[PDB]
Amino acid sequence: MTDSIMQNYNQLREQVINGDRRFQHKDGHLCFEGVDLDALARQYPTPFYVFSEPEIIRNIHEIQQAFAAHKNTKTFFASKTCSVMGVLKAIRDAGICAEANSQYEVRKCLEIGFRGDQIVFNGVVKKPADLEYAIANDLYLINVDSLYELEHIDAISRKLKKVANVCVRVEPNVVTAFHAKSGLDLEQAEETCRRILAMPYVHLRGLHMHVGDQVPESEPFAKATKVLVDESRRLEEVLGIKFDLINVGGGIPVPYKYDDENGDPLKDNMYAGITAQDFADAVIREVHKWRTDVEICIEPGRKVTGSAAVLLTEVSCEKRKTNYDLNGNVECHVEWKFVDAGYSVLSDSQHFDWFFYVYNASRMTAAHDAWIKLAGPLSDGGDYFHMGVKGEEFLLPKETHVGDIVAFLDAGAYTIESQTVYNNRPRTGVVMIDKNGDTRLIRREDSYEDMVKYDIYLLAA
Amino acid sequence: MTDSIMQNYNQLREQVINGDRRFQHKDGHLCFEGVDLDALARQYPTPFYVFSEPEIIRNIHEIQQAFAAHKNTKTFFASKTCSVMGVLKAIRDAGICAEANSQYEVRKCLEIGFRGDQIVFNGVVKKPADLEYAIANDLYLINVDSLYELEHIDAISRKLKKVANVCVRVEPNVVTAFHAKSGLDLEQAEETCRRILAMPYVHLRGLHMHVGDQVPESEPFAKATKVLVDESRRLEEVLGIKFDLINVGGGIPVPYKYDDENGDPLKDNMYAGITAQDFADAVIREVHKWRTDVEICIEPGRKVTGSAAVLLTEVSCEKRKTNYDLNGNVECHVEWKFVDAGYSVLSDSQHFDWFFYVYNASRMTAAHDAWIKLAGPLSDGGDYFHMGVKGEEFLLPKETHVGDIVAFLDAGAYTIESQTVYNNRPRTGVVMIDKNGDTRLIRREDSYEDMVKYDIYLLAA
Ligand SMILES: [Cl-]
Ligand SMILES: [Cl-]
Ligand SMILES: [Cl-]
Ligand SMILES: [Cl-]
Ligand code: NA
Ligand code: NA
Ligand code: NA
Ligand code: NA
């Protein structure tokens, strides 16, 4: 029933402004950490993302509190989730470490103040130049993803006369051969470790795995960790060593739909099937069957920042399209609202069928009582938001007007670096709400100069 | 049969180097317009795209030759397809016009030397600043996509005392109301045109439509053009005017799979179901039932550049993954080849299930006789190429080695502006082969400075 769907969506809306730790209402507008988002979107050109340092901190608290039963836990934010420097700075100041996924990610983590001993460098393609940069900067871990790459680590560590600290990525078969490009097979772990021990400037620290992203059950983490723990225990015996650590990766999910009573996480993984506590319980229980003193490294990405941003986008056009029958009578009307952000700004809404709550931030206390379709500004028929409240339809106040600010919630993970300049619309500015509730610009909107500065061409003037 | 699939793929490979107007072989390597692509990829860092000015010119020839039966045809390259300045310059020097999809696209077309009278500006969200820039620059056409936008065109043209030349976009119901965000309903065309005629600084030039992209049959173009032609004829009568033009949009498909005897274009639109001649026959036949003298405007994007680039990417790692049964016996092996381009470089291979021919450019004369899986360098389990020769599997020479150059063909449409800095891997350089067969860099690879120059942060040194 649409009425029931509409009723439920407006219960969720009221819970946003009366129940959510992030949000309030003022002057009829959605507020984030006490910042009126309508007013903010009159101060900065839309579309833009606004991050909350307070919410990042709360998310980091949930993660670390979840691991209270294991004191030697080291937490590395997976920076492919978001690497805007001011976001990395908030995460650094909140007291955790960083995982990096390219040479330039390593460099920006170092620049913003993560020490080498606070950085893990992972990857399936770590070219000699990448490895040389990482080894020269004394990173806490460089993962070993393949035997081919390991030969470069040996050669380059010898060349620099600097120890490379490594963890061997093993991807358990919980078809992994066909569908998992990353890591070594379990069967290869022993000889790989044996070979690293013999290398003069490579130091074996432990094994690594990463299950995946937005994982809706605890069992995959428990099963995969058990495989890694059993192999770690066995190799300690066979090789006569004591591992420094085990790195169990990331994948803690974030709620993108909150009404769990109406959702099946295994069918719709926008429902978060598990909590950080569930992830920690599964991991710690398995590790403690082997050692309670070993360091556990975790690599959460999405959970750190996902809930901690909103995309603000201005309703910039409207139209009504009407389907008529062959006698000219109306079959239905469609109310299109156009916002100034499309899939070049919010990639996952299109490419990964990702749901984000959508509300009229300018009319946040008004009933969202009109079915509408929400379109982006790209000259591209597929640039509209398909992941609606009911099918492809969204709910906004019937009073919605051009000039209102629409907010997409839970827009803090995998939303910035994935933007494009398709249609030569610019990638967005980014604003940060700091711990004091003050705002500042932390990324500019791309300028026209940015569209062409990369190009090499004969000028005309 | 895999053997048969392998046989057919190697027949296609031989046709590339012995039959294709674009390619040859030399020193065992794939050549493009006589340029050895292995050698080129030792001169420039991979991954990068290489465009062919000769092939752009050939594609433009096919389009214009297709319209020989209609002398007053004006051709506007849809620049959302590719707007690297050197690519736009080649298209300008080849003698056609430009369609633009944002304020900055308009600006870059003007900068590279398209005159205002050679530019069409389309869009669903043309804000006042966008319209003011377009009207001030005397564009040949600004489309009218909605009644809301039309009010801004009236007001701003009055403010500047400059005539805005417009075409009214009408999207026929050939559900269009639910699935087509663009244009007005046919039922709205009459009053919209009547209102424009009464505006002092808005000049109505005709109607506009655009069917879509990679369209595999001629019927949609014929049917939609007929609707637009019938309404144009009727409005000339009702309103007592003579239209300058009709703008029928783009959508000419490009072959991404060439063995048409084995493909159904309506099921797999990588097979191009129609040619430019088929598009022109359908459009011209319908227009000439109304007027033979009127100007026909077309907006091809993909067809201009799609076949005119190759992505060159270096095999940068390899591994074998083996699935074992519960007794330790081998069930299967998977041979993974890792290249230095993933979906942040070649977006559509992931997000739009787009097929591109893949060959070992370094071993182009060798039998491609080994099934492999082809992975990108992103730390992301989904970053491998799923659109294989058979399922998710590709064919490369069993002799393929790290350091070989892999080529993706037909990589010239919608491949540059759609790149991202996900994982802070840079967006690629772009090279151009000019009409003389010489090469030059036309876009640099993003530098590390580019990763962070947009960010605003307190430095440490
Ligand atoms: Cl930590
Ligand atoms: Cl309307
Ligand atoms: Cl022309
Ligand atoms: Cl291997
Ligand atoms: Na705005
Ligand atoms: Na060693
Ligand atoms: Na290279
Ligand atoms: Na007029």
UniProtKB/Swiss-Prot annotation, chains A, B:
The active site is at S379. The keyword Lyase applies. It comes from the Bacteria. Its EC number is 4.1.1.116. One of its GO terms (molecular function) is diaminopimelate decarboxylase activity. The modification N6-(pyridoxal phosphate)lysine is found at K80. It is an enzyme of class 4 (lyase). Optimum pH is 6.5-8. This is D-ornithine/D-lysine decarboxylase. The lineage of its organism: Bacteria, Pseudomonadati, Pseudomonadota, Gammaproteobacteria, Enterobacterales. The gene is dokD.
